[PDB]
Design an enzyme around this catalytic site. Structure first.
Site, PDB file in Angstrom:
ATOM      1  N   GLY A  20       1.895 -73.596 -15.270  1.00  0.00           N
ATOM      2  CA  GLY A  20       3.058 -73.845 -14.651  1.00  0.00           C
ATOM      3  C   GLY A  20       3.550 -73.774 -13.350  1.00  0.00           C
ATOM      4  O   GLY A  20       2.484 -73.556 -12.911  1.00  0.00           O
ATOM      5  N   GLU A  49       9.129 -60.067 -17.706  1.00  0.00           N
ATOM      6  CA  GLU A  49       9.634 -59.318 -16.819  1.00  0.00           C
ATOM      7  C   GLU A  49       8.611 -59.459 -15.328  1.00  0.00           C
ATOM      8  O   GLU A  49       7.725 -59.879 -15.164  1.00  0.00           O
ATOM      9  CB  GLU A  49       8.685 -57.743 -17.789  1.00  0.00           C
ATOM     10  N   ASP A 101      -2.091 -58.751  -8.793  1.00  0.00           N
ATOM     11  CA  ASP A 101      -2.710 -59.557  -9.669  1.00  0.00           C
ATOM     12  C   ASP A 101      -3.836 -58.516  -9.416  1.00  0.00           C
ATOM     13  O   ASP A 101      -4.696 -58.366  -8.570  1.00  0.00           O
ATOM     14  CB  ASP A 101      -2.746 -60.659 -10.455  1.00  0.00           C
ATOM     15  N   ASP A 125      -7.445 -65.603 -22.912  1.00  0.00           N
ATOM     16  CA  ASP A 125      -7.971 -66.461 -21.720  1.00  0.00           C
ATOM     17  C   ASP A 125      -7.555 -64.349 -21.226  1.00  0.00           C
ATOM     18  O   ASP A 125      -6.772 -64.946 -19.164  1.00  0.00           O
ATOM     19  CB  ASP A 125      -7.108 -67.205 -20.818  1.00  0.00           C
TER      20      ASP A 125
END
Length: 273
Positions: free
Chosen positions: A18, A89, A96, A135
């Site tokens: 998304g 959060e 990442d 995933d």
């Protein structure tokens, strides 16, 4: 009232999951991430105690979001006419794990050990809550750069954990196990262990071991970096071709390579700060 509770900041990213925006919870200035999912793009639906019909992603996040852990917590959610909005959060500051490995290259074993240990604890928590992520990969792991804590994100490909065979898969191919490639069948735990071997190789080598189907099913792991014999052993065990030859979570955490892990705060002081 959604639009008045959250100040919407810039787009953090978009794709299969998304569109995710940086946000601030107006009451207390809590950093949040605001995830928008289009109803047309949701195949997997579930329901809550209320029997209200929601994306599976909301079911799974609620199941894992109780107490503290290495999982991104769902703070709230809203239904709109064409979309769901999820309030998550947001660690600050954050990077990442994919970008971290791109920038720093192959991680030192002491840092990979700390990170891999935290991912194992987070995946045990999911399994203990009845949730299979499906995933696990560097792109779905956030580093809280000041606390040295890893957080698992993106349960949009996940499922309720079951002991019977899965015949559907919509996670990342190159983190997908050979039994999926060959038979379009897998069991949750043993497929999670495969994805963890891909992730550990990724940390200690700076990229994933396999690109083509033939490499995934071939049963050979080539090391492109200097990796200790104990780390190569754990990786090749996680990446066993036969799912029943892979270690349990207990066997991974008891492996000699996994001993003497740094605490999160030590990890941040030595490697991150």
């Amino acid at each position: 009232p959604l639009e008045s509770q959250y100040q919407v900041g810039p787009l953090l990213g978009s794709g299969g999951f998304g569109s995710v925006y940086s946000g601030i919870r107006v009451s207390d200035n809590l950093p949040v991430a605001i995830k928008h999912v289009e109803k047309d793009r949701i195949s997997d639906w579930g329901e809550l105690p209320n029997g209200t019909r929601v994306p599976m992603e909301v079911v799974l996040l609620k199941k894992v979001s109780s107490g503290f852990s290495g999982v991104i917590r769902l703070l709230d959610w809203f239904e709109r006419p064409d979309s769901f909005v999820l309030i998550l959060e947001r660690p600050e500051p954050v990077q990442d794990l994919f970008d971290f490995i791109t920038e720093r290259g192959a991680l030192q074993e002491e840092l990979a050990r700390s990170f891999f240990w935290q991912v194992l604890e987070a995946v045990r928590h999911c399994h203990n809550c009845g949730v299979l992520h499906r995933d696990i990969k560097d792109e779905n792991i956030l580093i809280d750069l000041n606390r040295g804590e890893l957080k698992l994100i993106d349960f949009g490909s996940g499922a309720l954990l079951k002991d019977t065979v899965y015949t559907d898969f919509d996670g990342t191919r190159v983190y997908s196990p050979p039994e999926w490639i060959r038979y379009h069948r897998y069991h949750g735990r043993s497929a999670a262990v495969w994805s963890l071997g891909i992730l550990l190789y990724d940390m200690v080598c700076g990229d994933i071991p396999f690109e083509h189907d033939e490499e995934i099913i071939g049963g050979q792991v080539f090391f492109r970096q200097r990796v200790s014999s104990e780390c190569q052993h754990l990786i090749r065990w996680c990446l066993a071709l036969r799912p029943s030859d892979r270690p349990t979570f207990e066997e991974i955490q008891n492996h000699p390579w996994m001993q003497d892990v740094l605490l999160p705060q030590e990890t941040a002081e030595i490697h991150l700060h």
